[PDB]
Ligand binder design. Structure first.
Ligand SMILES: [Mg+2]
Ligand SMILES: [Mg+2]
Ligand SMILES: [Mg+2]
Ligand SMILES: [Mg+2]
Ligand SMILES: [Mg+2]
Length: 186
RNA sequence: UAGCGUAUAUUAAAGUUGCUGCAGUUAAAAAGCUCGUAGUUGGAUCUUGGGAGCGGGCGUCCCCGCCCUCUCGGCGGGGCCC
């Protein structure tokens, strides 16, 4: 199988040729080759979400992430059309660096490579057509904390059915749980 | 009570020297006012929940083990190892 668009660490292409092939007959399409041949993906997951629903996550290099962000809605529309019954999200590959403890000549860890910043950026990239307008993290009496994220109320018609997939994906690849709301206009 | 009084130094009483812990309108006590160097003090932000068996009951509690590094390992190149 032609796997030309998937750079990796070195090796792993774990039967996820489906996304590469799908992009490959998203070749010869309408007005999408001016902005798709030069940029590619790193990895893809087919995690379980909610009930029997399935969502697929696509990991992208960061400058290539911004270049996906400019054309994401069209590509995700027909790629969901091909992969019927599943939801597609685009996430960067973010490279968290560990916190330096008291244990040769290491460099200063960038603030964007911290886990807090990475989780914030992941939450921002996960919901792309809508914009985050607030955060209402709440400690519920047990030491456990639930995050509540407010979306921009201008893409509610576009994205209101994916919120449980967003919650499942964010629980899967970050570990904490979120809810999504659409407040009245500010 | 075989002891008891007096003088003086000193401690508690004394939160009447105050770190714990005092005061400063009118009782004693805020500089006429502003700048200012030592001194003293100084906003928020970079690892957290799922983690590995013993684990105060995987019992959604958790004795608790976290699922630092590499040049000779010495129990020029075999696993039993440090
Ligand atoms: Mg005294
Ligand atoms: Mg007094
Ligand atoms: Mg007076
Ligand atoms: Mg000074
Ligand atoms: Mg501070």
């Amino acid at each position: 199988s032609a796997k030309i668009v998937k750079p990796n660490g070195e090796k792993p292409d774990e039967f996820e040729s489906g996304i590469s092939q799908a992009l490959l007959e998203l070749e010869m399409n309408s007005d999408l080759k001016a902005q798709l041949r030069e940029l590619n993906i790193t990895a893809a997951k087919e995690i379980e979400v909610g009930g029997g629903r399935k969502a697929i996550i696509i990991f992208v290099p960061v400058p290539q992430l911004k270049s996906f962000q400019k054309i994401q809605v069209r590509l995700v529309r027909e790629l969901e059309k091909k992969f019927s019954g599943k939801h597609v999200v685009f996430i960067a590959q973010r490279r968290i660096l560990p916190k330096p403890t008291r244990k040769k000549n290491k460099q200063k860890r960038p603030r964007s490579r911290t886990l807090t910043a990475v989780h914030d950026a992941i939450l921002e990239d996960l919901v792309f057509p809508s914009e985050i307008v607030g955060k209402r993290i709440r400690v519920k009496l047990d030491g456990s904390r639930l995050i509540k994220v407010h979306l921009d109320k201008a893409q509610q018609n576009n994205v209101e059915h994916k919120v449980e997939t967003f919650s499942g994906v964010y629980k899967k690849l970050t570990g904490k749980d979120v809810n999504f709301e659409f407040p009245e206009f500010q």
